[PDB]
Design a protein around this ligand. Structure first.
Ligand SMILES: CCCCCCCC/C=C\CCCCCCCC(=O)O[C@H](COC(=O)CCCCCCCCCCCCCCC)COP(=O)([O-])OCC[N+](C)(C)C
Ligand SMILES: Nc1cc(COc2c(Cl)cc(C[C@H](N)C(=O)O)cc2Cl)c2oc(-c3ccccc3)nc2c1
Ligand SMILES: CC(C)CCC[C@@H](C)[C@H]1CC[C@H]2[C@@H]3CC=C4C[C@@H](O)CC[C@]4(C)[C@H]3CC[C@]12C
Ligand SMILES: CC(C)CCC[C@@H](C)[C@H]1CC[C@H]2[C@@H]3CC=C4C[C@@H](O)CC[C@]4(C)[C@H]3CC[C@]12C
Lengths: 455, 52
């Protein structure tokens, strides 16, 4: 009767991954790689390098998600290995901080860049920027309540807008060549910070795994949607960087706070405003991809008993997990209050790579423990071990960049232990809690007409 | 857990609850259109910044 149906066709699966990888990153992040590389040559090499590293990681998730078909993605793969508590400590940080801060930050990037050509020389007014961020998050949690076919048609449209924008950037680059290595920071301690500052622009490649369970044919399409996307991203990134270097000198990219907009100003003149608006529409796609995917993580977390049971309920006539979406929207808007925001994410530099390393370590241990479990994909064990070894080094680099802030993040991870013991180990025994939990649950079921899924 | 599928739907069709859900859906979109009217007000009623 009631379940999350298999709506996601291969091209929409490619949309969910390319839309959330391409991000804001490539339109503003090049500056960060020149800062630590010094040289357009070394820069354009580390862009390719963390590309092939990201392909190698994604090929491990292309394995994992065919071995374990659960839509918990990065969380489910921990639960199936390290058991109850390690998986919860992830979900707590994702729920409290990482997903709602990420969703808000990229919505605020949507708001500022979409408005930017009304205010070319100055800040976009902050009391306007926070509304135009909130209107976006509210709209996309409405759309993703109404239909998964609407949700994925939205991300097809904006994934297209993003690649069209990068094709336009690349094309103008080649046109500038048609119109007719340097001083390198060759220290390994510089190169490693170049690479680590570039990996951010590929961050997103795991996001398809949190919707594995809604793919039309996961055992074929989940590994194919990775291999149809990350090589495409890697090519488009090295070509987009190439395009900037045809037009912006090293000094100008080291000192411009919105790299794509300067390239827009040089080539399009009166029409320069097109590139800011494309960075905006580009970020709208990333809010949608994140809200979609994020709603499935909390859904799964509640189905596995880690999280309050309301978030498992579905709306029977629309087949969307309405209480999980509503929770995710509210938790995003509660970040709108904060006077500063990037800092709260920077506290968890290490966390994304740590969870990935723990998932692929999990895949090693899972091969030793249960060889009989079905595996449509079986990658040469060199790649997992290479990728793990590399991440254990980047986790250390993430601390070495700022040994204070990764400590603050690690302090907040321990906030999960109070909540796990109160929410899972205590069995909610006091009747004045237990009856109130039930009363609130049955109220929400009545209030938005939602029911438990059927196994 | 909470209510069964049938157990919920036999109650959730009551006229008071049906009108409640319609009212909340209307109120939400009215509040979002009001927030858009607010955002557009602030974008107009602000200093269009100095030309280079
Ligand atoms: C402010 C009120 C917050 C509580 C909303 C509870 C009602 C939700 C509900 O059942 O939605 C539902 C979906 O409504 C939506 O599709 C949009 C939901 C917008 C989400 C905004 C969250 C912030 C409301 O509609 P419904 O009662 O399920 O009846 C079906 C009506 N349609 C969708 C077929 C027209
Ligand atoms: N643990 C963790 C996990 C994620 C989710 O995975 C990523 C996603 Cl979904 C997107 C990007 C950026 C994206 N590749 C782009 O091109 O802008 C990076 C990461 Cl690590 C985070 O996102 C961000 C983030 C996203 C946008 C702006 C600022 C910060 N911080 C994250 C921390
Ligand atoms: C709803 C979410 C997703 C997007 C919201 C963006 C809104 C706030 C933006 C997009 C385009 C904007 C309009 C574009 C151009 C003009 C003309 C100018 O002389 C005054 C502002 C005005 C009239 C803007 C008002 C605000 C506006 C409507
Ligand atoms: C059920 C409870 C938690 C409320 C859920 C809705 C909350 C999270 C949403 C609905 C509309 C939102 C507001 C919309 C617009 C603005 C103006 C902005 O310049 C500051 C934040 C502020 C004030 C938002 C804060 C969060 C908000 C109040």
């Amino acid at each position: 009767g009631v379940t999350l149906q298999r709506n996601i066709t291969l091209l929409n699966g490619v949309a969910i991954i390319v839309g959330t990888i391409i991000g804001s990153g490539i339109f503003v992040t090049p500056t960060g790689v020149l800062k630590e590389a010094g040289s357009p040559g070394l820069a354009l090499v580390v862009w390719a390098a963390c590309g092939v590293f990201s392909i190698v990681g994604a090929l491990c998730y292309a394995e994992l998600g065919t071995t374990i078909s659960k839509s918990g993605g990065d969380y489910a793969y921990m639960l199936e290995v390290y058991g109850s508590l390690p998986a919860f400590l992830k979900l707590w940080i994702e729920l409290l901080i990482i997903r709602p801060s990420s969703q808000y930050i990229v919505a605020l990037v949507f708001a500022t860049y979409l408005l930017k050509p009304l205010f070319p020389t100055c800040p976009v007014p902050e009391e306007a920027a926070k509304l135009v961020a909130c209107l976006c998050v509210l709209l996309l949690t409405a759309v993703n309540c109404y239909s998964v076919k609407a949700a994925t048609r939205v991300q097809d449209a904006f994934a297209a807008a993003k690649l069209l924008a990068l094709a336009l950037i690349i094309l103008l680059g080649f046109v500038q060549i048609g119109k007719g290595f340097e001083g390198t920071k060759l220290d390994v301690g510089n190169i490693v910070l170049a690479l680590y500052s570039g990996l951010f622009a590929y961050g997103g490649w795991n996001y398809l795994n949190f919707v594995t369970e809604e793919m039309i044919n996961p055992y074929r399409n989940l590994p194919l949607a990775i291999i149809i996307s990350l090589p495409i991203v890697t090519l488009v990134y090295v070509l987009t960087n190439l395009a900037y270097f045809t037009t912006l000198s090293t000094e100008q990219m080291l000192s411009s706070e919105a790299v794509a907009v300067d390239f827009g100003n040089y080539h399009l003149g009166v029409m320069s405003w097109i590139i800011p608006v494309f960075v905006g529409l580009s970020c709208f796609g990333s809010v949608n991809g994140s809200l979609f995917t994020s709603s499935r993580l909390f859904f799964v977390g509640s189905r596995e008993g880690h999280l309050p049971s309301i978030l498992s309920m579905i709306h029977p006539q629309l087949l969307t997990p309405v209480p999980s979406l509503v929770f995710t929207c509210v938790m995003t808007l509660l970040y709108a209050f904060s006077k500063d925001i990037f800092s709260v994410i920077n506290f968890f530099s290490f966390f994304n790579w740590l969870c990935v390393a723990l998932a692929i370590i999990g895949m090693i241990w899972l091969r030793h423990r249960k060889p009989e479990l079905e595996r449509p994909i079986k990658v040469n064990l060199a790649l997992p071990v290479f990728f793990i070894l590399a991440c254990l080094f980047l986790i250390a680099v993430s601390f070495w960049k700022t040994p204070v802030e990764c400590g603050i993040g690690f302090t907040i991870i321990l906030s999960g232990l109070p909540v796990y013991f109160f929410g899972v180990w205590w069995k909610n025994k006091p009747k004045w809690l237990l009856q109130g939990i039930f009363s609130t649950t049955v109220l929400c079921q009545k209030l938005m007409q939602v029911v438990p899924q059927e196994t | 857990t909470g209510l069964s599928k049938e157990e919920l739907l036999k109650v959730a069709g009551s006229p008071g609850w049906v009108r409640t859900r319609w009212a909340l859906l209307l109120l939400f979109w009215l509040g979002w259109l009001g927030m858009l009217a607010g955002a557009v007000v602030i974008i107009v009623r602000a200093p269009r910044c100095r030309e280079l």
